[PDB]
């Protein structure tokens, strides 16, 4: 696996999402697009907006075709509405192919675009079942795969800087790689461990076991996938269902309760600061997620460091310090393996064989002591029972 053109083609930050550059229409207009495995709608700003430095102008694409249907997408936070249509799309640092795709011209947004986030659109990489207005609205990836020789698979290497990033610095830094139709061997170390996709809608997985420093949380594993568990590049934190959240937090407090912390810290509302270079990593637990594997009774695990679940943030005050926001949050809609998780791993969305691969990111953020890992195989029983059912 060797796709040199697409290595380093993303930019961004776990806080505001990762984006790739695309083009649209004839002649073609360049837009930065947020990569989002947590939805299935390709949509772009098509009208001016405080935060947007540029936008899609249909009136200038000779190949644009209006579909005369409105759409409305509501995300976990933020929502928009637009008009549907099609036009020709390309990725400059992707494969040299052009593709007619459904595109939503976003005409009203609310809490959607981020100030100086640098992206102007969203690329929903998930499956048609969750496309709005309905599943007959074919997702971008589907079209790419149907109309060209690109294989039905892509991979993401989300890279964290290790420290806060400016807007200037985000633009100039490399934010990661999105390999389309492939796996690049140089972006990961160790081995790819695949988990099955439970159902083609979100990229849904089953978590069978959860460990903090190796200590099982001892829960009916059904609790970890209540009511789904998904991988999502457009979610900042690892988000967890209420029962599990409290249980997990408790455990971490215990593991590093050589320091009690502001209560608003855990609820993600406050920073924590240490002097430059003096961040006490070793005092913080590692988290392990065991994921249903390929064969019956077989699973594997992935392990994240505190470097993953404590987001670096710029302290406007002091600024010569090292500050973090706690990047694990509560959820009332199942588990979400957000970007904070993924920046540990090369992740492989093997749509063609209904499975998701994990490997250790060649670019991951680590200390001279521990390091993140993808280990297996483990033997767990009656895994199907961890799946939750409506």
């Amino acid at each position: 696996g060797s796709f040199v053109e697409m290595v380093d083609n993303l930019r961004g930050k776990s806080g505001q999402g990762y984006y790739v550059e695309m083009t649209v229409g004839s002649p073609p207009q360049t837009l930065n697009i947020l990569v989002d495995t947590g939805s299935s709608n390709f949509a772009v700003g098509a009208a001016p907006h405080p935060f947007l430095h540029r936008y899609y102008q249909r009136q200038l694409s000779s190949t644009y075709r209006d579909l005369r249907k409105g759409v409305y997408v509501p995300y976990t936070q933020g929502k928009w509405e637009g008009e549907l249509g099609t036009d020709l799309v390309s990725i400059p640092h992707g494969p040299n192919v052009t593709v007619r795709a459904n595109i939503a011209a976003i005409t009203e947004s609310d809490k959607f675009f981020i100030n100086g986030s640098n992206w102007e659109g969203i690329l929903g990489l998930a499956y048609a079942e969750i496309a709005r207005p309905d599943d007959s609205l074919e997702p971008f990836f589907d079209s790419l795969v149907k109309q060209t020789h690109v294989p039905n698979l892509f991979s993401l290497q989300l890279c964290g800087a290790g420290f806060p990033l400016n807007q200037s610095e985000v633009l100039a830094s490399v934010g990661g790689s999105m390999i389309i139709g492939g796996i690049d061997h140089s972006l990961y170390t160790g081995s790819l461990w695949y988990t099955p996709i439970r159902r083609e809608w979100y990229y849904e997985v089953i978590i069978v076991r959860v460990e903090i420093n190796g200590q099982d949380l001892k829960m009916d594993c059904k609790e970890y996938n209540y009511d789904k568990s998904i991988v999502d590049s457009g979610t900042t934190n690892l988000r967890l269902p209420k029962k599990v959240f409290e249980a997990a937090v408790k455990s971490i407090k215990a593991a590093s309760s050589t320091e009690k912390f502001p209560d608003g810290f855990w609820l993600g509302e406050q920073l924590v600061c240490w002097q430059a270079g003096t961040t006490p990593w070793n005092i913080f637990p590692v988290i392990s997620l065991y994921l249903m594997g390929e064969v019956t009774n077989q699973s594997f695990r992935i392990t994240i460091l505190p470097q993953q679940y404590l987001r670096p943030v710029e302290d406007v005050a002091t600024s010569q310090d090292d500050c973090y926001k706690f990047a694990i949050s509560q959820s009332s809609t199942g588990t979400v393996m957000g970007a904070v998780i993924m920046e540990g791993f090369y992740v492989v969305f093997d749509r063609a064989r209904k499975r998701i691969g994990f490997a250790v990111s060649a670019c991951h953020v680590h200390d001279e002591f521990r390091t993140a890992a993808v280990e297996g195989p483990f033997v767990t029983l009656d895994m199907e029972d961890c799946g939750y059912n409506i």
């Binding site: 806080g15 505001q16 999402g17 947020l34 989002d36 495995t37 947590g38 939805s39 299935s40 709608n41 997408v73 509501p74 995300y75 976990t76 936070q77 933020g78 929502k79 981020i114 969203i122 929903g124 998930a126 969750i130 709005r132 999502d232 590049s233 457009g234 979610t235 900042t236 934190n237 988000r239 809609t333 970007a339």
Partner: peptide, 9 residues
């Protein structure tokens, strides 16, 4: 923070 599509809304 980003948090990308909802069920129903």
């Amino acid at each position: 923070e980003v948090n990308x599509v909802a069920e129903x809304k």
